[PDB]
């Protein structure tokens, strides 16, 4: 592969090696919120975090990825739109340049400085490989970041960061608790979509919080100190990993609330 976020392989090229890039359920979308509607049928989603085993951080040259022992049903997701255990496997960002960008999904076309992604399989199908083949093989949860007072919960992503400052490196990630990326509320929009990054299969159940969390300046700005080159190549800074959204199709988006 040799996508990723650059003018000469960013996503307007990726449909070129992935041409489901061009599909009827891709994500990211935007969120037009007064046509999103109520589904009273929905039930109240259900994330059970607390036996949650963190395991190791990752800069993958596209994002950072800290990465679940997912062997058990420990840390789950259920509820609200769907049916069965999805087990979380890894979470990671998308952030921009500038404050002004940087989620994938956008509401009413506010663009947010950052989106996070909780990242779960559907344990129906026994593994990720086997899920990302399936229409409900995935469940993730989108959570939005702005810029404003620190989040405690953050701080110990945000620190181990230098240590796995280019491509191909990693750290030893435990006990690290996802409870403390969690805003207060639940509610939700959903819609059936797709990964947004290459192999952009179109596997996914989006669940993403309409309350986002607040993080610090300073926590933001070390994500951007990152790089998407490995160790001993000319530097490109992470930012702009996000994918913008995409043509909503036939599809309509269900809100919790
Ligand atoms: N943002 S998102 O949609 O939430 C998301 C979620 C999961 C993943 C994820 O774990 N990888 C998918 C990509 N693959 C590598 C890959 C890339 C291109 C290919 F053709 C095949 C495999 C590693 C596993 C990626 C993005
Ligand atoms: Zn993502």
New binding site residues.
């Given amino acids: 592969?040799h996508?990723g976020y650059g003018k000469h392989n960013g996503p307007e090229h990726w449909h070129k090696?992935?041409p489901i890039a061009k599909g009827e359920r891709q994500?990211p979308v935007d969120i037009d919120t007064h046509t999103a509607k109520y589904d009273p049928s929905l039930k109240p989603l259900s994330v059970s975090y607390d036996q949650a085993t963190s395991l190791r951080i990752l800069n993958?040259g596209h994002?950072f990825?800290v990465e679940f022992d997912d062997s058990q049903d420990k840390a789950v997701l259920k509820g609200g739109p769907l049916d069965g255990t999805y087990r979380l496997?890894?979470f990671?960002f998308?952030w921009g340049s500038l404050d002004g960008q940087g989620s994938?999904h956008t509401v009413d076309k506010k663009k947010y400085a950052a989106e996070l992604?909780l990242?779960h399989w559907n344990t129906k199908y026994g593994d990720?490989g086997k899920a990302?083949q399936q229409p409900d093989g995935?469940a993730?949860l989108?959570i939005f970041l702005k810029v404003g007072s620190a989040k405690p919960g953050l701080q110990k992503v945000v620190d181990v960061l230098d240590s796995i400052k280019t491509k191909g490196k990693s750290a030893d990630f435990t006990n690290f608790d996802p409870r403390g990326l969690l805003p207060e509320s639940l509610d939700y929009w959903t819609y059936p979509g797709?990964?947004?990054?290459?192999?952009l299969?179109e596997c996914?159940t989006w669940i993403v919080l309409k309350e986002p969390i607040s993080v610090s300046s300073e926590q933001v700005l070390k994500f951007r100190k990152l790089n998407f080159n490995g160790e001993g190549e000319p530097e490109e800074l992470m930012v702009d990993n996000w994918?913008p959204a995409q043509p909503l199709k036939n599809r309509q988006i269900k809100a919790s609330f």
Wanted: proline share 7%; no cysteine; charged share 10%.
């Fill in positions: 592969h996508w090696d992935f994500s993958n994002a990825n496997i890894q990671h998308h994938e992604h990242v990720f990302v995935l993730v989108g797709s990964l947004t990054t290459p192999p299969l996914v994918r």
